[PDB]
């Protein structure tokens, strides 16, 4: 079950006031998170470092990264497989009936790409919450 790609740019209105983006993926699921190219019909690339964080680090908006979106001329992507066990030493691993979070504390500009605190996250509600299972 391939869920709908999530485009990580501020034109994305699925990031709702306060709540952000809320998804409910089942185990076995796959989800692409895409940082989109500045193409021939769009002015103003949005610089983000996107991270998987724990509830408390998502609440609220600090880090200590799945996408490094600092490439205007290239569609950059992460695809999560929501699986309980990965044979990758650094693989992402997920529990039925548990919540995971993804934020960015970068403020959209090159200068703040690497801002370890703020965002996106706490300014524009730029985050996902995955209620798995």
């Amino acid at each position: 079950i391939v869920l709908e790609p999530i485009y990580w740019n501020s034109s994305n209105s699925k990031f709702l006031p306060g709540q952000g983006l809320v998804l409910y993926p089942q185990i076995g699921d796959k989800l692409d998170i895409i940082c989109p190219k500045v193409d021939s019909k769009t002015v103003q690339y949005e610089y983000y470092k996107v991270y998987m964080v724990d509830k408390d680090q998502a609440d609220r908006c600090t880090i200590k990264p799945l996408l490094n979106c600092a490439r205007p001329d290239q569609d950059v992507k992460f695809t999560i497989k929501f699986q309980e066990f990965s044979p990758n030493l650094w693989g992402l691993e997920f529990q039925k009936n548990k919540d995971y979070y993804i934020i960015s504390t970068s403020n959209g500009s090159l200068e703040g790409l690497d801002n370890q605190e703020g965002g996106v996250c706490q300014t524009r509600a730029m985050k996902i919450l995955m209620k798995v299972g």
Binding site: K30, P65, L66, L67, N68, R71, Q74, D75, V76, K77, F78, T79, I80, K81, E84, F85, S86, P87, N88, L89, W90, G91, L92, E93, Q95
Partner: protein, 188 residues
């Protein structure tokens, strides 16, 4: 003291420097087959990975993974550097009699990209055995909690090559492994 050997390397294929899906061919197309997804490597950068881990579930089954068609360019001998993690069998829960700490590598040349999902025969001849690859280092994990391990690096050799291109395949018979990256190249 100061003797120099310069020998330039030309890349045939490099999965690390791809930011979209690899879309490689698997057979048989069943739950348990190898699977593409993003992960981090020891450089800590997000790359396209392939995983298989069908260790008790497998009953005499072979999970094959095969790259896209690769132009040989001017290569007669190709190098294939693999980076991977491999789990210790007696440390996995629910691992069966099937569990291997190894995998096998093959190639097939053809003059055009005319391989399909079911052609040619997924078996040695028409596939050419490169090697069975064992792990110097095993990874141990506790689901959700903790892991210990080191990435394996192996560079296999293959050829001589004649035709316009080739494909590289991986045959799994019971391992729990992540292929973190593959780099095919030749030295001019």
């Amino acid at each position: 003291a100061g003797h120099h050997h310069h020998h330039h390397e030309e890349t045939l294929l490099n999965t690390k420097l791809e930011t979209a899906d690899l879309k490689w061919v698997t057979f048989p197309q069943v739950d348990g087959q190898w699977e593409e997804l993003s992960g981090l490597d020891e450089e800590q950068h997000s790359v396209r990975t392939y995983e298989v881990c069908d260790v008790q579930r497998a009953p005499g089954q072979a999970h094959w993974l095969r790259t896209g068609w690769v132009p040989r360019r001017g290569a007669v001998h190709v190098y294939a550097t693999l980076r991977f993690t491999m789990l210790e069998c007696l440390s996995l829960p629910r691992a069966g009699r099937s569990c291997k700490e190894t995998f096998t590598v093959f190639y097939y040349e053809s003059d055009a990209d005319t391989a399909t999902a079911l052609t040619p025969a997924w078996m040695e001849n028409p596939y050419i055995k490169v090697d069975t690859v064992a792990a110097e280092h095993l990874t141990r994990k506790r689901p959700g909690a903790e892991a210990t391990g080191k990435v394996n690096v192996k560079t296999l050799r293959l050829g001589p090559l004649s035709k316009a291109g080739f494909y590289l395949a991986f045959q799994d018979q019971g391992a729990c492994m992540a292929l973190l990256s593959l780099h095919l190249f030749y030295k001019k």
